[PDB]
């Protein structure tokens, strides 16, 4: 009678908070309600109300970014892959970009990004070796035909402070594709990582810094670029920008996400909330799930501690403890049990370790514990 | 009620009569579409995940089949917007090679001066043919050489190369044809009482155009998107172009697009705000006008009329669309239209009318009957004692 849509809500028990397969950052009700208000009718998306004339949509969020990063100017495109392409194509078409050989490998966890840079029409001057880039071999690559000095967050090297110096010395713009999209200091939450945020790279004097909006920033998909007004303007005039132009849903979502950062409402940004769940809340979740599952014949269940990587393939540096519930059935293999769980309504996506199914509490929401249980007992039944 | 500073992006009452109003956000979405978008967004999903195989999969698998069924094409792809599609098509099929296009079809594409500059930046060599207002099949044909890669045509924005001619050349010389229709029209408008020479996807493909593209938020009435359909061979090339990854559509627009396409499948055309608005009865529009004319009768210095206008609701991308409508014309004696207009734009919520010879027009085609109160309540405050 009625067909159900292909795209569906999914219970994520993999423990990966920034999970690309499963949509990256979830958005809070508050962010979504705003997106709904704007979408449900007409708005001032590309309209300057004071002057009653067409205006650019980026004006709606650029103040937000500049403040939060201390940059001169900001701009936003479809995604950060696009930002990279746009920056290269703008500043370095027919010219040379200097980048470390390793930083070019699997950019962002993607094998498509380095090729995008190749399509940008920039000539890539790869210096050094896969895990060795000496500042000297970098500085020596510099030509009259050198137009950009690049660094990419990874997935001895040249350091950001060095990039800045080479840039000042030879009069070449510096671009750091940060990736993570991080706005805040993760130390302010109890978490320890060498993950540079936007504000910091600009404090150091990086000319251009870019990142995704749907990783550590915890907003919708977006390519955020910030830095020198001179470079920004060039980028906004690049007609390619128009193909990369951000839509109304993501832009509204981005404005409300950024308002949250201003009002210090970090609890209303799911990515942060989940990343700052204390180890105690997590054990409690597990213990409760174990509880829920003990009336299921055939199931062996234990609660285990685990050092996991909730950041995903773009942020494999982020390491946090978590609690998982481990299950094993006497008649169904983990793989088949997995396959069945993915077919449920809603689907449940757990991870597999050494012939066990792990439910990682870092990403499982409390209201869905009941659902895991009901689903498990229907599946292991006849 | 709960905001320290109010957000810069805001809802606006649209009284211009332009349904496809780019300044004002183009196509609004139904609650049904927004609710789906909401569910998908408020948690995790299978956005890039193949639940069967338990592995990564591409998000376009979620909507390719709708597009294919609805248009008859062999295959389909969706990118950020239709500006992107054009860039992607050209860069993919004709990097460092020639694309033949009608001189005038290259001018103010889709109401935009940036699209043609984008095409130049695609890596393609644009071989412009004929002259601004005249393109002769013979000139087009003779621009063809070994280095020619793509035969193109673009939606208008007298003698021209017609679609059927484009197809024939393409077949004759063995060069793929691409039609940037722009409008995104999925269904014939004649089925809705609307008389327009506006080509839809299915029709363009059945003629044999290799590739057809358009926006998702004009006539289609979904969120922003660049929709591309046609021969599998060409689509697959387009999908392998790493540039595609930079143009990749996000979760909100993809979800919204799936639900939009589902509405078409169920022929629930009433749930597509663009369609709904363009099919409003002439009689239904006069009712709103008269209700508002009556709602404003008690306003000091307000001269209130109701006129009957021939308007263009498609916007600068679709000027060939003309539809009757009803407006309410107002004129204060103290305040001038410009100044009154300015004040309406600063109200909460803002109101955006159009002006005609020092008179304000409130076109009912785009005003929702639920808003008429707000318009009154606002005009009285701006014009009180």
Swiss-Prot record, chain A:
GO cellular component, as recorded: cytoplasm
Enzyme Commission (EC) number: 2.9.1.1
Gene3D superfamilies listed in its UniProt record: 3.90.1150.180, Type I PLP-dependent aspartate aminotransferase-like (Major domain)
Annotated compartments: Cytoplasm
Pathway recorded for this protein: Aminoacyl-tRNA biosynthesis; selenocysteinyl-tRNA(Sec) biosynthesis; selenocysteinyl-tRNA(Sec) from L-seryl-tRNA(Sec) (bacterial route): step 1/1
Keyword Cell inner membrane: no
GO molecular function: identical protein binding; L-seryl-tRNA(Sec) selenium transferase activity
Transferase found in the keyword field: yes
Catalytic activity reported: L-seryl-tRNA(Sec) + selenophosphate + H(+) = L-selenocysteinyl-tRNA(Sec) + phosphate
Primary location: cytoplasm
Bridged cysteine pairs (disulfide): none
Stated family: Belongs to the SelA family.
The name this protein goes by in its record: L-seryl-tRNA(Sec) selenium transferase
């Amino acid at each position: 009678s009625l067909m159900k849509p292909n795209i569906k809500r999914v219970i994520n028990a993999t423990g990966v908070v920034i999970n690309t397969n499963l949509g990256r950052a979830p958005l809070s009700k508050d962010v979504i309600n705003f997106i709904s208000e704007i979408a449900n009718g007409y708005s001032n998306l590309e309209y300057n109300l004071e002057e009653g004339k067409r205006g650019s949509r980026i004006a709606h969020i650029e103040k937000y970014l500049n403040e939060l990063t201390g940059a001169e100017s900001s701009f936003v495109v479809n995604n950060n892959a696009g930002a990279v392409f746009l920056v290269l194509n703008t500043l370095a078409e027919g010219k040379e970009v200097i980048i470390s050989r390793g930083e070019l490998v699997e950019i962002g966890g993607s094998f498509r990004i380095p090729d995008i840079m190749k399509k940008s029409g920039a000539i890539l001057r790869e210096v050094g070796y896969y895990n060795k880039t000496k500042v000297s071999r970098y500085e020596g690559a510099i030509n009259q035909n050198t137009a950009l000095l690049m660094k990419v967050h990874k997935s001895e090297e040249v350091k950001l402070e060095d990039l800045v110096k080479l840039g000042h010395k030879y009069g070449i713009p510096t671009y750091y594709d940060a990736g993570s999209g991080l706005l805040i200091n993760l130390k302010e939450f109890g978490i320890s990582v060498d993950e540079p945020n936007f504000r910091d790279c600009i404090s150091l004097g990086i000319d251009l810094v870019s990142g995704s909006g749907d990783k550590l920033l915890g907003g919708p998909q977006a390519g955020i670029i910030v830095g020198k007004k001179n470079l920004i303007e060039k980028i906004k005039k690049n007609p390619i920008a128009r193909a990369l132009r951000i839509d109304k849903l993501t832009l509204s979502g981005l404005e409300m996400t950024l308002k949250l950062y201003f009002e210090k409402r970090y609890e209303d940004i799911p990515v942060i909330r989940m990343l700052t769940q204390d180890e105690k809340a997590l054990r409690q979740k597990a213990k409760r799930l174990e509880k829920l599952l003990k009336d299921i014949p055939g199931l062996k269940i234990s609660v285990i501690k685990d050092k996991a990587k909730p950041g995903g393939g773009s942020l494999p540096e982020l390491e946090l403890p978590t609690y998982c519930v481990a299950i094993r059935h006497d008649r169904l293999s983990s793989q088949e049990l997995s396959r069945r769980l993915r077919l449920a309504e809603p689907p449940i996506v757990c991870r597999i370790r050494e012939d066990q199914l792990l439910f990682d509490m870092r990403t499982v929401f409390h209201e869905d514990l009941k659902t895991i249980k009901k689903t498990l007992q229907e599946l292991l039944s006849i």
